[PDB]
């Protein structure tokens, strides 16, 4: 679990969005596993606007933050799970690192701010849904 709080927006994994999130929807994209809902109070997370490929992510299944190198946002095949059929997920970045189902929502950050959140994993890999292209989160 986990979310990004920027301005009057809450960014979560679409597959983990609560009933309150759908009742206050701003934008969602199943192909990116992202959902943005509106908030009453202002959030303090700063979104990164960069092309960094190194950062630190939070891994709830280890209660630890790990430094990682990660790929550029890409269209990547994700096998069928309990949340989606087999499909290509867009804007996804992979890194070599531990992740389990329960770790989705963990933040990935670089020196410029929030880069994305854990969205996929398996086989000693961890994948993050990029948010650096969503310029509108800043306004
Ligand atoms: C951090 S998720 C994870 C981590 C390790 C092993 C894993 C996972 N699972 C996932 O990758 N998914 C479940 C949640 C939604 C994902 C998506 N964006 O399509 C897919 C479950 C199946 C494969 O097994
Ligand atoms: Zn950066």
How far apart, in whole angstroms, are the C-alpha atoms of residue 94 and residue 131? 14
How far apart, in whole angstroms, are the C-alpha atoms of residue 41 and residue 22? 18
* 54-59/107-110 β-pairing: antiparallel
Any ligand 1 atom below 6 A from CB of 37: no
The residue ranges of every structural domain in the chain are: 3-44, 45-139
The 10 Å CB-count burial string (b at 16+, else e) for 118-134 is bbbbeeeebbbbbbbeb
User: Pocket of ligand 1, candidates 120, 125, 127, 130: which has the most ligand atoms within 8 Å of its Cβ, to mutate?
Assistant: 120
* 52 labelled binding-site residue: yes
Any ligand 1 atom below 6 A from CB of 102: no
Do residues 36 and 13 touch, judged by C-beta distance below 8 A? no
Q: Which two tokens stand for residue 65?
A: 């933050």
CA 58, chain centre distance (Å)? 11
How far apart, in whole angstroms, are the C-alpha atoms of residue 7 and residue 42? 5
State the resolution, in angstroms: 1.5
């Amino acid at each position: 679990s986990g979310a990004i709080y920027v301005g009057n927006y809450r960014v979560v994994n679409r597959h983990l969005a609560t009933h309150n999130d759908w009742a206050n929807l701003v934008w969602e994209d199943s192909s990116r596993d992202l959902l943005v809902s509106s908030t009453t109070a202002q959030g303090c997370d700063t979104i990164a606007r960069c092309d960094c490929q190194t950062g630190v992510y939070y891994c709830s299944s280890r209660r630890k933050h790990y430094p990682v190198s990660f790929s550029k946002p890409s269209l990547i095949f994700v096998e069928a799970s309990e949340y989606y059929p087999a499909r290509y997920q867009s804007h996804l970045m992979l890194a070599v690192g531990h992740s389990e189902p329960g770790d989705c929502g963990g933040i990935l950050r670089c020196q410029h701010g929030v880069v994305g959140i854990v969205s996929t994993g398996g086989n000693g890999l961890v994948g993050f849904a990029d948010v650096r292209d969503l310029l509108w989160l800043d306004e």
